[PDB]
Amino acid sequence: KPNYALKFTLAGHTKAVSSVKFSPNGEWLASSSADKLIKIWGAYDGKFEKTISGHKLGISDVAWSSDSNLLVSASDDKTLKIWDVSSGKCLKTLKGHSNYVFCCNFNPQSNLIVSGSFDESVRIWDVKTGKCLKTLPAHSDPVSAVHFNRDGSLIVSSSYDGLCRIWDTASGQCLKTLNPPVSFVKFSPNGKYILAATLDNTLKLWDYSKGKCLKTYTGHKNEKYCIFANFSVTGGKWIVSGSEDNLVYIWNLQTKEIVQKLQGHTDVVISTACHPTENIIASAALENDKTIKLWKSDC
Ligand SMILES: Cc1nc(F)ccc1-c1cc(Cn2ccn(C)c2=N)cc(C(=O)NCc2ccc(Cl)c(Cl)c2)c1
């Protein structure tokens, strides 16, 4: 069992925190917020580094490029923005969605960005030009998550419509459809499995090639919000997720037993992230809390 303990509470956002992500080189934590700002924090000392501003409405999501130099943010102003982290400057504004942009990610090469929107579409953008390359009529309800697999050849998307769809990046064509609302989806690190959250207090680990569910994780509270979930792989093999009972849940991946519930937040833990090399979790909560917490375990 892990023994995550609170190391830092990061305060500064003035509305709900929407997403936290560690940079791939492990050095930074980025946070987005309904307060229209991105904040950058030291991953190991918790130290506030800078605020990045420019969006006209709340930010739902942020994601890092592979070299840790760029960020992309998704916003209720219906755009995404590409940021140079070291200068804080907006490089591109990605325009095209007809409703709030909810989720975003770079591919491993980081020449592409994928986005999902309340307009029920998934878009694929060129990082260099900022132009939309493809619009996928992906779903029949808001898109809750978008994720590239390990080499970027595939995109997985999820939606309130209850579907999880896998797309061929190069052509935009749908390869597989896996119905309670699906509130989150992500590829496993090797790209073989998919972790999917549904709004019936349930996480499931699917085999992608087989199209069958392998494990089911329950005990948390998730019926209203799209809550990030993670594979923790630096120590023991865990599943990590937030919860609407203000706790961070950690399951043993193989046995599906809840092995730790992290107490401290005073609102829904909407986002969790796992550090790329250290046994460190970042968690962030909604507007009655507005803080980010950094936790460290020996295993
Ligand atoms: C707090 C905040 N502030 C802003 F300014 C803008 C957005 C948000 C926000 C963030 C998250 C976490 N998050 C973000 C990206 N990703 C992949 C996530 N999991 C979730 C929600 C949510 O649950 N909103 C209702 C809802 C229910 C069902 C569906 Cl289907 C959808 Cl799409 C949304 C809202």
Whether ligand 1 lies within 6 angstroms of the CB of 58 is answered as yes
Distance from residue 135's CA to the centre of ligand 1 (Å):
21
Q: For the stretch 128-165, what's the b/e string if a residue is b when 16 or more beta carbons lie within 10 angstroms of its beta carbon?
A: eebebebebebbeebbbbbbbbeebebbbbbbbbbbbb
Does CATH number 3.90.1310.10 belong to domain 1-299?
A: no
Contact indicator for 122, 116 with CB cutoff of 8 Å = yes
- Give me the sign of the Cα torsion angle 176, 155, 254, 199: negative
Whether ligand 1 lies within 6 angstroms of the CB of 117 is answered as no
- Token couple for 78: 């219906």
Please tell me what resolution, in angstroms, this structure has.
1.7
Q: Report the SS3 class of residue 239.
A: strand
Distance from residue 25's CA to the centre of ligand 1 (Å):
26
- Token couple for 297: 């375990």
Mutation test residue for ligand 1: of 53, 55, 60, 159, the one with most atoms within 8 Å of CB: 60
The domain segmentation of the chain, as residue ranges, is 1-299
Q: Report the SS3 class of residue 208.
A: coil
Whether ligand 1 lies within 6 angstroms of the CB of 61 is answered as yes
- Token couple for 61: 């999501």
Distance from residue 101's CA to the centre of ligand 1 (Å):
10
Distance in angstroms (rounded) separating the CA atoms of residues 91 and 218: 42
- Token couple for 232: 């923790």
Ligand 1 atom 10 nearest Cα: 18
| Largest Cα span, the chain | 47
Contact indicator for 160, 138 with CB cutoff of 8 Å = no
Mutation test residue for ligand 1: of 14, 17, 18, the one with most atoms within 8 Å of CB: 18
- Give me the sign of the Cα torsion angle 108, 214, 146, 281: negative
